[PDB]
Design a protein around this ligand. Structure first.
Ligand SMILES: Nc1ncnc2c1ncn2[C@@H]1O[C@H](COP(=O)(O)OP(=O)(O)S)[C@@H](O)[C@H]1O
Length: 454
């Protein structure tokens, strides 16, 4: 190891410690955070070979096996449910099919689960920002039956409720309603899991989606009739869930009907000077993706990864640039970030990939910030890491957390902490992430930015 690299390692160790100190002092200064729109329930079942074989045999083995080779990508019956699970096994492929049959939803609910967990980008961040970081959080919960409400951790997590004509903020467990359970059934299996002659080449999971409301970005009445009152209680907002929108719906609805409401919420937010952050998850429909780019000028910040940025370059960049962004080639990434800012004029773009983060901010000149991250060799959990990175950096920076790069450093600690411990309970635990070595390949990469850029 050359001394030029040993010194950089020493420097980044100090920056990480100071970035964590700064974040601990600024996070308490955030008046409140608004989180919308997607919250649901995640039901995890660890598949048992015998149980699954009994259920396949009971419903018709040939029917289920017919489906494996002729998948319908839409669960209309119990045999299509089992056939889809077995196909995810055979291929070791991550799959998710929508459940359009009430009868099998009863079968799913009856079949049960091993672990029950909050879902939706807005939901998981309510437990993080509110439960761990202790920031007053207002979260949008489309449907809040008892099963949904109990999944929020203790802390300053609130939902709006109407007391006749007044709006009140209460913990989700105190605002239970006779509403639908929005459950995503997640069936996990390891490598080697065998059912009849079907053996998994790798670990993976099959998801039976039984949630009609988040699929349409349903908004509950309190958020449509009391948004202004809600906005007065928050300083920041993080928006998500819009990646699902279809161009047309059976009842005649379009994506534009939902984005009209979203645009009205942004107008209210900007009127109160609330800083907003959009989570630009991969949006299959190209036209909806185009409308979301057109809506970014009303956002303060946007967060995305190599897949999501490459997907956006497919419609405002060139195919070659997208293919390089997808692989994390930093220079192509920087270009794509400037192309996105040129197209939208947004104030802040936060890019995260394996090894390093980037933040392009503008105001008095475009300024680029770069940090090498902390990679865990064997994560205990990998779900919600991306939301944790975007939310942590956004709340830390705009909380007065020490600047853009310091906010990225904190997000890198929060990501590493969640990975090595699985689930975070209090912010003090993130301190343990300081011991995770900083990615040296990314540290050396910064030398290339210092040559090209001056
Ligand atoms: N081992 C490990 N340790 C710490 N952090 C990690 C690790 N592996 C990946 N990452 C980060 O998580 C992101 C993957 O989540 P994505 O961007 O897909 O968002 P999601 O919400 O889907 S997890 C990816 O961009 C990385 O910056």
């Amino acid at each position: 190891m050359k001394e030029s690299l040993k010194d950089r390692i020493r420097l980044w160790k100090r920056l990480y410690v100071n970035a964590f100190e700064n974040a601990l002092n600024a996070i308490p200064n955030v008046k409140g955070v608004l989180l919308a729109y997607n919250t649901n329930i995640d039901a995890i079942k660890y598949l048992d070979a015998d149980d699954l074989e009994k259920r396949v045999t009971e419903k018709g083995k040939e029917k289920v096996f017919e489906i494996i080779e002729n998948p319908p990508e839409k669960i209309s019956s119990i045999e299509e449910l089992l056939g889809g699970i077995l196909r995810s096994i055979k291929l070791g492929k991550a799959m998710e099919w929508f459940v359009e049959s009430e009868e099998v939803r009863r079968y799913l609910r009856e079949w049960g689960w091993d672990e029950l967990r909050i879902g939706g980008q807005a939901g998981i961040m309510a437990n993080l920002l509110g439960g761990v970081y202790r920031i007053p959080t207002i979260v949008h919960v489309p449907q809040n039956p008892k099963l949904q409400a109990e999944l929020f951790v203790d802390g300053p997590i609130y939902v709006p409720v109407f007391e006749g004509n007044k709006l009140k903020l209460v913990h989700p467990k105190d605002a239970i309603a006779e509403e639908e359970e929005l459950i995503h059934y997640i069936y996990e299996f390891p490598r080697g899991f065998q059912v009849f002659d079907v053996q998994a080449p790798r670990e993976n999971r099959f998801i039976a989606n039984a949630d009609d409301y988040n699929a349409r970005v349903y908004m509950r009445r309190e958020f449509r009739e009391g948004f202004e009152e809600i906005t007065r209680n928050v300083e920041l907002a993080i928006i998500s869930g819009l990646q699902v929108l279809k161009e047309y719906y059976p009842d005649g609805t379009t994506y534009k009907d939902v984005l009209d409401r979203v645009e009205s919420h942004l107008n209210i937010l900007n009127r109160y000077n609330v800083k907003s952050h959009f989570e630009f998850a991969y949006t299959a429909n190209r036209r909806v993706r185009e409308a979301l780019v057109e809506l970014l000028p009303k956002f303060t910040s946007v967060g995305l990864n190599e897949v999501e940025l490459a997907s956006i370059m497919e419609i405002i960049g060139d195919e070659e640039l997208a293919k390089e962004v997808l692989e994390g080639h930093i220079f192509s990434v920087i270009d794509a970030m400037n192309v996105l800012m040129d197209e939208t004029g947004i104030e802040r773009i936060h890019f995260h990939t394996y090894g390093y983060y980037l933040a392009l901010t503008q105001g008095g000149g475009r300024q680029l910030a770069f940090v090498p991250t902390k990679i865990v060799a064997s994560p205990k959990s990998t779900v919600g890491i991306g939301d944790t990175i975007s939310s942590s950096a956004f709340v830390s920076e705009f909380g007065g957390g020490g600047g853009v790069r310091d906010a990225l450093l904190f997000a890198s600690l929060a990501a590493a902490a969640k990975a090595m411990k699985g689930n975070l309970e209090r912010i003090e635990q993130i301190r343990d992430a300081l011991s995770v070595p900083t990615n040296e390949r990314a540290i050396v990469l910064e030398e290339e930015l210092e040559k090209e850029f001056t």
